[PDB]
Short mmCIF file of N, CA, C and O and ligand atoms in Angstrom, two decimals:
data_model
loop_
_atom_site.label_atom_id
_atom_site.label_comp_id
_atom_site.label_asym_id
_atom_site.label_seq_id
_atom_site.Cartn_x
_atom_site.Cartn_y
_atom_site.Cartn_z
N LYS A 979 0.85 -1.22 0.07
CA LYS A 979 0.00 -0.02 0.05
C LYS A 979 0.89 1.23 -0.01
O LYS A 979 1.87 1.26 0.81
N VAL A 980 0.58 2.21 -0.84
CA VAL A 980 1.23 3.57 -0.88
C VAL A 980 0.28 4.47 -0.19
O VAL A 980 -0.81 4.82 -0.75
N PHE A 981 0.60 4.89 1.04
CA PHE A 981 -0.21 5.84 1.84
C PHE A 981 -0.19 7.20 1.22
O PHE A 981 0.89 7.63 0.81
N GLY A 982 -1.28 7.95 1.39
CA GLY A 982 -1.17 9.39 1.35
C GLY A 982 -0.52 9.94 2.61
O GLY A 982 -0.52 9.30 3.64
N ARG A 983 -0.02 11.18 2.52
CA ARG A 983 0.65 11.86 3.69
C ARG A 983 -0.32 11.91 4.95
O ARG A 983 0.06 11.47 5.97
N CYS A 984 -1.47 12.51 4.73
CA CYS A 984 -2.43 12.65 5.86
C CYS A 984 -3.04 11.37 6.30
O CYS A 984 -3.32 11.14 7.48
N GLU A 985 -3.29 10.48 5.35
CA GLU A 985 -3.70 9.14 5.63
C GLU A 985 -2.69 8.40 6.56
O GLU A 985 -3.12 7.78 7.46
N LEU A 986 -1.42 8.53 6.24
CA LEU A 986 -0.40 7.87 7.16
C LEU A 986 -0.37 8.54 8.49
O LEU A 986 -0.19 7.88 9.52
N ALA A 987 -0.44 9.89 8.54
CA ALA A 987 -0.39 10.71 9.73
C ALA A 987 -1.52 10.19 10.65
O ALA A 987 -1.24 9.90 11.86
N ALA A 988 -2.70 10.00 10.07
CA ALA A 988 -3.85 9.52 10.81
C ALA A 988 -3.65 8.09 11.37
O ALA A 988 -3.97 7.83 12.53
N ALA A 989 -3.08 7.20 10.61
CA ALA A 989 -2.84 5.81 11.04
C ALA A 989 -1.80 5.85 12.12
O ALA A 989 -1.90 5.02 13.09
N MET A 990 -0.75 6.62 12.00
CA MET A 990 0.35 6.67 13.04
C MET A 990 -0.17 7.18 14.32
O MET A 990 0.09 6.64 15.41
N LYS A 991 -1.00 8.23 14.29
CA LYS A 991 -1.60 8.87 15.43
C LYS A 991 -2.55 7.81 16.22
O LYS A 991 -2.44 7.69 17.44
N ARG A 992 -3.27 7.14 15.41
CA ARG A 992 -4.26 6.14 16.01
C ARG A 992 -3.47 5.08 16.77
O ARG A 992 -4.02 4.61 17.81
N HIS A 993 -2.33 4.68 16.21
CA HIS A 993 -1.50 3.57 16.80
C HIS A 993 -0.49 4.15 17.83
O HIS A 993 0.38 3.33 18.25
N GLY A 994 -0.63 5.41 18.21
CA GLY A 994 0.06 5.99 19.36
C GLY A 994 1.46 6.32 19.07
O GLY A 994 2.22 6.53 20.01
N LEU A 995 1.84 6.67 17.85
CA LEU A 995 3.25 7.08 17.51
C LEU A 995 3.43 8.59 17.84
O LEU A 995 4.58 9.01 18.02
N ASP A 996 2.37 9.35 17.73
CA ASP A 996 2.46 10.84 17.91
C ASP A 996 2.98 11.23 19.28
O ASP A 996 2.32 10.83 20.29
N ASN A 997 4.12 11.85 19.37
CA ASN A 997 4.85 12.23 20.65
C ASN A 997 5.40 10.99 21.33
O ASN A 997 5.80 11.16 22.57
N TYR A 998 5.55 9.87 20.68
CA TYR A 998 6.15 8.66 21.25
C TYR A 998 7.62 8.94 21.52
O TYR A 998 8.28 9.37 20.50
N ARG A 999 8.14 8.73 22.72
CA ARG A 999 9.44 9.03 23.14
C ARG A 999 9.79 10.51 22.69
O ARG A 999 11.02 10.87 22.47
N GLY A 1000 8.77 11.38 22.68
CA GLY A 1000 8.97 12.87 22.56
C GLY A 1000 9.15 13.21 21.14
O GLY A 1000 9.39 14.45 20.84
N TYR A 1001 8.90 12.30 20.14
CA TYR A 1001 8.94 12.57 18.72
C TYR A 1001 7.50 12.88 18.17
O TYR A 1001 6.61 12.03 18.14
N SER A 1002 7.33 14.18 17.80
CA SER A 1002 6.08 14.67 17.18
C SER A 1002 5.73 13.93 15.94
O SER A 1002 6.63 13.40 15.26
N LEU A 1003 4.46 13.88 15.61
CA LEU A 1003 3.97 13.08 14.50
C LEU A 1003 4.71 13.48 13.17
O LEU A 1003 5.00 12.55 12.33
N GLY A 1004 5.03 14.74 12.96
CA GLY A 1004 5.69 15.16 11.70
C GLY A 1004 7.08 14.47 11.54
O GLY A 1004 7.44 14.14 10.39
N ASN A 1005 7.74 14.23 12.63
CA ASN A 1005 9.07 13.45 12.58
C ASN A 1005 8.81 12.04 11.98
O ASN A 1005 9.65 11.62 11.17
N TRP A 1006 7.73 11.36 12.39
CA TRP A 1006 7.44 9.98 11.86
C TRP A 1006 6.98 9.99 10.41
O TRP A 1006 7.41 9.08 9.66
N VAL A 1007 6.21 10.98 10.08
CA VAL A 1007 5.68 11.07 8.64
C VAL A 1007 6.89 11.50 7.78
O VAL A 1007 7.03 10.79 6.72
N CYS A 1008 7.74 12.38 8.17
CA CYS A 1008 8.99 12.73 7.43
C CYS A 1008 9.84 11.46 7.25
O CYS A 1008 10.41 11.22 6.20
N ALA A 1009 10.09 10.70 8.30
CA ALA A 1009 10.95 9.54 8.22
C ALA A 1009 10.34 8.58 7.29
O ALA A 1009 11.09 8.04 6.35
N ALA A 1010 9.04 8.32 7.25
CA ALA A 1010 8.37 7.40 6.35
C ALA A 1010 8.56 7.90 4.93
O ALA A 1010 8.81 7.08 4.00
N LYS A 1011 8.35 9.17 4.68
CA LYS A 1011 8.46 9.80 3.35
C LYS A 1011 9.90 9.39 2.77
O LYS A 1011 9.93 8.82 1.65
N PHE A 1012 10.95 9.58 3.47
CA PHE A 1012 12.29 9.48 2.89
C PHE A 1012 12.81 8.06 3.06
O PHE A 1012 13.61 7.58 2.21
N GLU A 1013 12.32 7.25 3.99
CA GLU A 1013 12.69 5.87 4.02
C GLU A 1013 12.02 5.12 2.94
O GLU A 1013 12.72 4.29 2.25
N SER A 1014 10.72 5.22 2.61
CA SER A 1014 9.93 4.30 1.78
C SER A 1014 9.09 5.01 0.73
O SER A 1014 8.41 4.30 0.04
N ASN A 1015 9.06 6.39 0.70
CA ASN A 1015 8.05 7.16 -0.03
C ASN A 1015 6.64 6.64 0.20
O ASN A 1015 5.82 6.54 -0.66
N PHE A 1016 6.42 6.32 1.56
CA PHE A 1016 5.05 5.92 2.06
C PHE A 1016 4.60 4.61 1.50
O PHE A 1016 3.36 4.32 1.60
N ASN A 1017 5.49 3.76 1.05
CA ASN A 1017 5.18 2.39 0.51
C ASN A 1017 5.48 1.34 1.54
O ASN A 1017 6.60 1.08 1.80
N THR A 1018 4.43 0.62 1.99
CA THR A 1018 4.53 -0.44 2.98
C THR A 1018 5.33 -1.65 2.37
O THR A 1018 5.88 -2.39 3.11
N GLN A 1019 5.42 -1.72 1.01
CA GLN A 1019 6.04 -2.85 0.33
C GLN A 1019 7.52 -2.60 0.08
O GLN A 1019 8.15 -3.44 -0.60
N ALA A 1020 8.09 -1.50 0.48
CA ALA A 1020 9.46 -1.10 0.14
C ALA A 1020 10.40 -2.15 0.86
O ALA A 1020 10.23 -2.50 1.98
N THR A 1021 11.46 -2.55 0.08
CA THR A 1021 12.55 -3.38 0.60
C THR A 1021 13.84 -2.84 0.05
O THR A 1021 13.85 -2.25 -1.05
N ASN A 1022 14.92 -2.96 0.81
CA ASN A 1022 16.23 -2.46 0.35
C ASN A 1022 17.32 -3.35 1.01
O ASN A 1022 17.32 -3.39 2.21
N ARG A 1023 18.09 -4.05 0.20
CA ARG A 1023 19.20 -4.89 0.77
C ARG A 1023 20.37 -4.00 1.20
O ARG A 1023 20.79 -3.08 0.46
N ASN A 1024 20.95 -4.36 2.30
CA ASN A 1024 22.15 -3.70 2.88
C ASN A 1024 23.40 -4.50 2.49
O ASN A 1024 23.31 -5.73 2.12
N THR A 1025 24.56 -3.84 2.62
CA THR A 1025 25.90 -4.42 2.20
C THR A 1025 26.15 -5.70 2.95
O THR A 1025 26.77 -6.56 2.40
N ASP A 1026 25.71 -5.70 4.27
CA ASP A 1026 26.06 -6.80 5.19
C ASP A 1026 25.18 -8.08 4.93
O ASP A 1026 25.41 -9.03 5.62
N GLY A 1027 24.21 -7.94 3.95
CA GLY A 1027 23.32 -9.10 3.69
C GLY A 1027 21.94 -9.02 4.46
O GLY A 1027 21.05 -9.79 4.03
N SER A 1028 21.80 -8.09 5.43
CA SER A 1028 20.50 -7.77 6.01
C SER A 1028 19.66 -7.03 4.98
O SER A 1028 20.12 -6.61 3.99
N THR A 1029 18.35 -6.85 5.33
CA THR A 1029 17.37 -6.15 4.43
C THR A 1029 16.57 -5.19 5.29
O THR A 1029 16.23 -5.55 6.43
N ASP A 1030 16.19 -4.07 4.77
CA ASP A 1030 15.29 -3.13 5.36
C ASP A 1030 13.85 -3.29 4.79
O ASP A 1030 13.73 -3.44 3.60
N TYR A 1031 12.88 -3.34 5.63
CA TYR A 1031 11.49 -3.67 5.31
C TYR A 1031 10.48 -2.56 5.67
O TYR A 1031 10.41 -2.20 6.84
N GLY A 1032 9.58 -2.27 4.77
CA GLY A 1032 8.32 -1.61 5.07
C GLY A 1032 8.47 -0.08 5.11
O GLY A 1032 9.44 0.49 4.65
N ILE A 1033 7.42 0.56 5.62
CA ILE A 1033 7.26 2.01 5.43
C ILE A 1033 8.32 2.75 6.29
O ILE A 1033 8.69 3.90 5.86
N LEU A 1034 8.93 2.16 7.32
CA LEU A 1034 10.02 2.68 8.15
C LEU A 1034 11.29 1.83 7.98
O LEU A 1034 12.21 2.17 8.67
N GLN A 1035 11.36 1.02 6.97
CA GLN A 1035 12.68 0.41 6.51
C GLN A 1035 13.39 -0.21 7.69
O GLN A 1035 14.58 0.12 7.95
N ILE A 1036 12.66 -1.03 8.49
CA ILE A 1036 13.23 -1.70 9.64
C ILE A 1036 14.14 -2.89 9.24
O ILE A 1036 13.70 -3.71 8.37
N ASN A 1037 15.25 -3.06 9.93
CA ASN A 1037 16.36 -3.91 9.41
C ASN A 1037 16.25 -5.33 10.07
O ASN A 1037 16.03 -5.36 11.33
N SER A 1038 16.49 -6.35 9.29
CA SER A 1038 16.53 -7.77 9.74
C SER A 1038 17.79 -8.03 10.60
O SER A 1038 17.83 -9.08 11.27
N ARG A 1039 18.83 -7.16 10.61
CA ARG A 1039 19.98 -7.40 11.42
C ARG A 1039 19.59 -7.50 12.90
O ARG A 1039 20.16 -8.32 13.65
N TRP A 1040 18.53 -6.81 13.32
CA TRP A 1040 18.20 -6.73 14.73
C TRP A 1040 16.71 -6.94 15.06
O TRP A 1040 16.44 -7.48 16.12
N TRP A 1041 15.81 -6.59 14.10
CA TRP A 1041 14.41 -6.42 14.47
C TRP A 1041 13.35 -7.38 14.02
O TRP A 1041 12.44 -7.44 14.55
N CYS A 1042 13.74 -8.13 12.96
CA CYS A 1042 12.75 -9.11 12.42
C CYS A 1042 13.46 -10.28 11.82
O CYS A 1042 14.59 -10.20 11.58
N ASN A 1043 12.76 -11.38 11.64
CA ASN A 1043 13.31 -12.61 10.99
C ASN A 1043 12.94 -12.70 9.53
O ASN A 1043 11.70 -12.70 9.25
N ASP A 1044 13.92 -12.79 8.64
CA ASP A 1044 13.72 -13.07 7.24
C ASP A 1044 14.34 -14.41 6.81
O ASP A 1044 14.29 -14.73 5.65
N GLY A 1045 14.99 -15.11 7.83
CA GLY A 1045 15.64 -16.41 7.47
C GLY A 1045 16.88 -16.29 6.59
O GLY A 1045 17.37 -17.39 6.18
N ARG A 1046 17.36 -15.09 6.25
CA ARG A 1046 18.46 -14.94 5.27
C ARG A 1046 19.47 -13.86 5.82
O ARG A 1046 20.22 -13.31 4.95
N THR A 1047 19.48 -13.63 7.11
CA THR A 1047 20.47 -12.73 7.76
C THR A 1047 21.12 -13.48 8.92
O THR A 1047 20.86 -13.27 10.11
N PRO A 1048 22.07 -14.39 8.57
CA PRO A 1048 22.77 -15.17 9.59
C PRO A 1048 23.44 -14.35 10.72
O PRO A 1048 24.02 -13.30 10.51
N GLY A 1049 23.18 -14.82 11.95
CA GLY A 1049 23.76 -14.22 13.13
C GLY A 1049 22.91 -13.07 13.62
O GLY A 1049 23.29 -12.39 14.61
N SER A 1050 21.77 -12.80 13.01
CA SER A 1050 20.97 -11.64 13.32
C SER A 1050 20.03 -11.92 14.50
O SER A 1050 19.84 -13.07 14.88
N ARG A 1051 19.41 -10.85 15.00
CA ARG A 1051 18.35 -10.98 16.11
C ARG A 1051 17.00 -10.71 15.49
O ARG A 1051 16.93 -10.32 14.24
N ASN A 1052 16.00 -10.98 16.24
CA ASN A 1052 14.56 -10.71 15.94
C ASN A 1052 13.88 -10.11 17.16
O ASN A 1052 13.03 -10.77 17.76
N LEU A 1053 14.28 -8.84 17.48
CA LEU A 1053 13.93 -8.20 18.73
C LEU A 1053 12.42 -7.80 18.70
O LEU A 1053 11.83 -7.70 19.80
N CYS A 1054 11.81 -7.69 17.53
CA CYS A 1054 10.33 -7.39 17.50
C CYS A 1054 9.53 -8.69 17.44
O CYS A 1054 8.35 -8.54 17.46
N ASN A 1055 10.20 -9.80 17.40
CA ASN A 1055 9.58 -11.17 17.45
C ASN A 1055 8.55 -11.30 16.34
O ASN A 1055 7.37 -11.70 16.55
N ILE A 1056 8.93 -10.94 15.09
CA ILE A 1056 8.00 -10.90 13.90
C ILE A 1056 8.76 -11.47 12.68
O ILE A 1056 9.98 -11.26 12.57
N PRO A 1057 8.07 -12.11 11.70
CA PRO A 1057 8.64 -12.15 10.39
C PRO A 1057 8.70 -10.80 9.77
O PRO A 1057 7.84 -10.02 9.93
N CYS A 1058 9.81 -10.59 9.04
CA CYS A 1058 9.96 -9.27 8.36
C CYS A 1058 8.80 -9.05 7.47
O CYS A 1058 8.45 -7.88 7.25
N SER A 1059 8.18 -9.99 6.89
CA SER A 1059 6.97 -9.91 6.01
C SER A 1059 5.86 -9.12 6.75
O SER A 1059 5.05 -8.40 6.10
N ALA A 1060 5.79 -9.23 8.07
CA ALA A 1060 4.73 -8.46 8.85
C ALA A 1060 4.91 -6.97 8.64
O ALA A 1060 3.96 -6.24 8.82
N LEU A 1061 6.09 -6.54 8.31
CA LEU A 1061 6.41 -5.10 8.09
C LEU A 1061 6.03 -4.65 6.69
O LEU A 1061 6.23 -3.45 6.39
N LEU A 1062 5.51 -5.53 5.83
CA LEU A 1062 5.14 -5.20 4.45
C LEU A 1062 3.66 -5.11 4.21
O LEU A 1062 3.25 -4.67 3.10
N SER A 1063 2.91 -5.38 5.31
CA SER A 1063 1.42 -5.35 5.26
C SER A 1063 0.86 -4.00 4.93
O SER A 1063 1.46 -2.96 5.31
N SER A 1064 -0.35 -3.93 4.39
CA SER A 1064 -1.13 -2.65 4.23
C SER A 1064 -1.41 -2.04 5.56
O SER A 1064 -1.47 -0.79 5.68
N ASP A 1065 -1.64 -2.87 6.58
CA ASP A 1065 -1.87 -2.55 8.00
C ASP A 1065 -0.52 -2.20 8.64
O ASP A 1065 0.30 -3.17 8.76
N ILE A 1066 -0.33 -1.07 9.19
CA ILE A 1066 0.98 -0.56 9.74
C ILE A 1066 1.17 -1.04 11.18
O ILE A 1066 2.26 -0.67 11.73
N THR A 1067 0.26 -1.72 11.83
CA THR A 1067 0.35 -2.09 13.28
C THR A 1067 1.75 -2.69 13.54
O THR A 1067 2.38 -2.25 14.53
N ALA A 1068 2.26 -3.66 12.83
CA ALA A 1068 3.51 -4.33 13.07
C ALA A 1068 4.65 -3.33 12.95
O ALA A 1068 5.54 -3.28 13.91
N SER A 1069 4.66 -2.50 11.97
CA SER A 1069 5.76 -1.46 11.78
C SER A 1069 5.71 -0.53 12.95
O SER A 1069 6.78 -0.17 13.44
N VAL A 1070 4.57 -0.06 13.40
CA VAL A 1070 4.48 0.96 14.55
C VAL A 1070 4.98 0.26 15.73
O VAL A 1070 5.75 0.91 16.51
N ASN A 1071 4.49 -0.93 16.04
CA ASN A 1071 4.99 -1.56 17.30
C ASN A 1071 6.41 -1.80 17.36
O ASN A 1071 7.00 -1.69 18.44
N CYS A 1072 7.04 -2.17 16.21
CA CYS A 1072 8.46 -2.42 16.19
C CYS A 1072 9.23 -1.09 16.22
O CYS A 1072 10.23 -0.98 16.94
N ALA A 1073 8.71 -0.07 15.54
CA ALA A 1073 9.31 1.28 15.62
C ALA A 1073 9.39 1.71 17.07
O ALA A 1073 10.37 2.42 17.49
N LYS A 1074 8.37 1.46 17.86
CA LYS A 1074 8.25 1.90 19.26
C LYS A 1074 9.44 1.29 20.04
O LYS A 1074 10.03 2.04 20.83
N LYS A 1075 9.74 0.02 19.79
CA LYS A 1075 10.97 -0.68 20.39
C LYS A 1075 12.24 -0.05 19.94
O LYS A 1075 13.08 0.30 20.78
N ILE A 1076 12.35 0.25 18.64
CA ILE A 1076 13.64 0.74 18.06
C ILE A 1076 13.86 2.14 18.72
O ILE A 1076 14.99 2.38 19.19
N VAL A 1077 12.90 3.02 18.70
CA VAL A 1077 13.08 4.43 19.15
C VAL A 1077 13.30 4.49 20.65
O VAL A 1077 13.82 5.57 21.15
N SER A 1078 13.04 3.41 21.36
CA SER A 1078 13.19 3.27 22.83
C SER A 1078 14.58 2.78 23.21
O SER A 1078 14.80 2.61 24.36
N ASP A 1079 15.42 2.42 22.32
CA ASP A 1079 16.60 1.61 22.59
C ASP A 1079 17.85 2.43 22.98
O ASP A 1079 18.84 1.85 23.27
N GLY A 1080 17.71 3.77 23.07
CA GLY A 1080 18.73 4.69 23.57
C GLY A 1080 19.12 5.72 22.54
O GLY A 1080 19.46 6.86 22.97
N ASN A 1081 18.90 5.45 21.25
CA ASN A 1081 19.45 6.32 20.12
C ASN A 1081 18.29 7.06 19.48
O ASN A 1081 18.56 7.92 18.62
N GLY A 1082 17.11 6.90 20.01
CA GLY A 1082 15.95 7.66 19.49
C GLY A 1082 15.85 7.46 17.98
O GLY A 1082 15.96 6.35 17.50
N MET A 1083 15.45 8.55 17.24
CA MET A 1083 15.12 8.38 15.80
C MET A 1083 16.36 8.43 14.97
O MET A 1083 16.25 8.20 13.77
N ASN A 1084 17.55 8.60 15.61
CA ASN A 1084 18.87 8.39 14.85
C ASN A 1084 19.05 6.96 14.28
O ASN A 1084 19.78 6.89 13.34
N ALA A 1085 18.27 6.06 14.71
CA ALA A 1085 18.23 4.68 14.13
C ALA A 1085 17.88 4.75 12.61
O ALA A 1085 18.26 3.86 11.88
N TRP A 1086 17.11 5.74 12.23
CA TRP A 1086 16.67 5.91 10.86
C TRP A 1086 17.54 6.88 10.11
O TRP A 1086 17.43 8.13 10.41
N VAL A 1087 18.36 6.39 9.24
CA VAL A 1087 19.43 7.22 8.53
C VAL A 1087 18.71 8.36 7.74
O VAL A 1087 19.19 9.48 7.84
N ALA A 1088 17.62 8.12 7.13
CA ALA A 1088 16.91 9.15 6.33
C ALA A 1088 16.37 10.24 7.33
O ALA A 1088 16.31 11.42 6.90
N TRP A 1089 15.86 9.81 8.49
CA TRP A 1089 15.42 10.82 9.48
C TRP A 1089 16.56 11.73 9.86
O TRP A 1089 16.40 12.99 9.79
N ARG A 1090 17.71 11.15 10.30
CA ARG A 1090 18.89 11.94 10.67
C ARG A 1090 19.28 12.88 9.61
O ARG A 1090 19.58 14.06 9.84
N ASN A 1091 19.25 12.43 8.33
CA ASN A 1091 19.90 13.20 7.26
C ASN A 1091 18.91 14.17 6.56
O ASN A 1091 19.37 15.08 5.95
N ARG A 1092 17.61 13.89 6.65
CA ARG A 1092 16.60 14.67 5.85
C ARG A 1092 15.51 15.25 6.75
O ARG A 1092 14.63 16.05 6.15
N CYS A 1093 15.40 14.83 7.96
CA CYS A 1093 14.23 15.30 8.83
C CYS A 1093 14.75 16.05 10.03
O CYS A 1093 14.17 17.09 10.40
N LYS A 1094 15.71 15.50 10.79
CA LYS A 1094 16.24 16.09 12.03
C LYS A 1094 16.59 17.54 11.78
O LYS A 1094 17.39 17.83 10.89
N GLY A 1095 16.08 18.42 12.64
CA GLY A 1095 16.43 19.80 12.59
C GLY A 1095 15.76 20.63 11.48
O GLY A 1095 16.00 21.82 11.37
N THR A 1096 14.78 20.00 10.83
CA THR A 1096 14.02 20.63 9.71
C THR A 1096 12.59 20.99 10.27
O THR A 1096 12.27 20.57 11.44
N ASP A 1097 11.80 21.65 9.49
CA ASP A 1097 10.42 21.98 9.85
C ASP A 1097 9.49 20.74 9.61
O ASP A 1097 8.80 20.66 8.65
N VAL A 1098 9.61 19.74 10.52
CA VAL A 1098 8.90 18.43 10.33
C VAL A 1098 7.38 18.68 10.45
O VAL A 1098 6.64 17.80 9.95
N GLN A 1099 6.90 19.76 11.03
CA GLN A 1099 5.48 19.99 11.23
C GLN A 1099 4.81 20.13 9.86
O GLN A 1099 3.67 19.85 9.69
N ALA A 1100 5.61 20.54 8.80
CA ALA A 1100 5.16 20.68 7.41
C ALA A 1100 4.50 19.34 6.94
O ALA A 1100 3.60 19.39 6.22
N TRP A 1101 5.00 18.25 7.50
CA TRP A 1101 4.55 16.88 6.99
C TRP A 1101 3.13 16.53 7.46
O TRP A 1101 2.51 15.69 6.85
N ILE A 1102 2.67 17.26 8.47
CA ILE A 1102 1.24 17.03 8.94
C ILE A 1102 0.36 18.31 8.79
O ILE A 1102 -0.81 18.26 9.15
N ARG A 1103 0.90 19.32 8.16
CA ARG A 1103 0.14 20.61 7.96
C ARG A 1103 -1.04 20.31 7.08
O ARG A 1103 -0.81 19.56 6.15
N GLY A 1104 -2.21 20.84 7.37
CA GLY A 1104 -3.38 20.63 6.51
C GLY A 1104 -4.15 19.38 6.81
O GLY A 1104 -5.25 19.23 6.50
N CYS A 1105 -3.51 18.43 7.53
CA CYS A 1105 -4.18 17.12 7.84
C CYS A 1105 -5.17 17.41 9.02
O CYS A 1105 -4.87 18.17 10.00
N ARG A 1106 -6.25 16.64 8.96
CA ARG A 1106 -7.36 16.74 9.89
C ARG A 1106 -7.09 15.69 10.94
O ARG A 1106 -7.47 14.61 10.76
N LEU A 1107 -6.30 16.22 12.07
CA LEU A 1107 -6.05 15.14 13.01
C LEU A 1107 -6.59 15.45 14.43
O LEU A 1107 -6.56 16.56 14.83
AR1 AR B 1413 -1.78 1.70 -2.78
AR1 AR B 1414 6.52 -6.74 -0.80
AR1 AR B 1415 13.41 -15.92 15.03
AR1 AR B 1416 8.88 -14.30 14.30
AR1 AR B 1417 3.28 -11.43 12.63
AR1 AR B 1418 3.34 -11.61 7.40
AR1 AR B 1419 4.76 2.90 10.69
AR1 AR B 1420 19.11 -0.70 13.75
CL1 CL B 1421 0.84 0.20 -4.41
CL1 CL B 1422 -3.92 11.19 2.38
CL1 CL B 1423 3.79 13.78 -0.04
CL1 CL B 1424 -7.02 6.20 10.12
CL1 CL B 1425 5.19 15.69 27.57
CL1 CL B 1426 5.14 17.71 14.01
CL1 CL B 1427 11.94 1.60 -1.84
CL1 CL B 1428 18.08 -15.16 9.69
CL1 CL B 1429 16.16 -11.88 19.29
CL1 CL B 1430 9.49 -15.72 11.50
CL1 CL B 1431 -3.02 0.98 9.15
CL1 CL B 1432 15.48 10.96 22.00
NA1 NA B 1433 16.83 -11.14 11.95
#
């Protein structure tokens, strides 16, 4: 599924991401934009042989099982395929664990490089939330 901007903002808010670990909703919508272009089906292989999955490009090195990342963990206790669903529940719940782990939203390279320190409220402006 390719979300609209306000459609995703609404889904993220409903699942409790808005101000989660003090990150305003615009930070999460901005991260999703530059990680996946709001596409739940997005995948990207990493140099180390891990893969990033879903609208927030969550990595199989630590967070989910894909059966093809030897030595890796599955800290969200999910198949990586759960992160590719039209339903964002699994991505939101796993993101909550990631952003809780000490490094906040710096876990998302696109957030650090393209969202952090920018006008992230722009990503929810006009949305009826
Ligand atoms: Ar779609
Ligand atoms: Ar997919
Ligand atoms: Ar596993
Ligand atoms: Ar799993
Ligand atoms: Ar699952
Ligand atoms: Ar799945
Ligand atoms: Ar998400
Ligand atoms: Ar990570
Ligand atoms: Cl699509
Ligand atoms: Cl929308
Ligand atoms: Cl957009
Ligand atoms: Cl909704
Ligand atoms: Cl507060
Ligand atoms: Cl915001
Ligand atoms: Cl992609
Ligand atoms: Cl594996
Ligand atoms: Cl694990
Ligand atoms: Cl699994
Ligand atoms: Cl959803
Ligand atoms: Cl933080
Ligand atoms: Na894994």
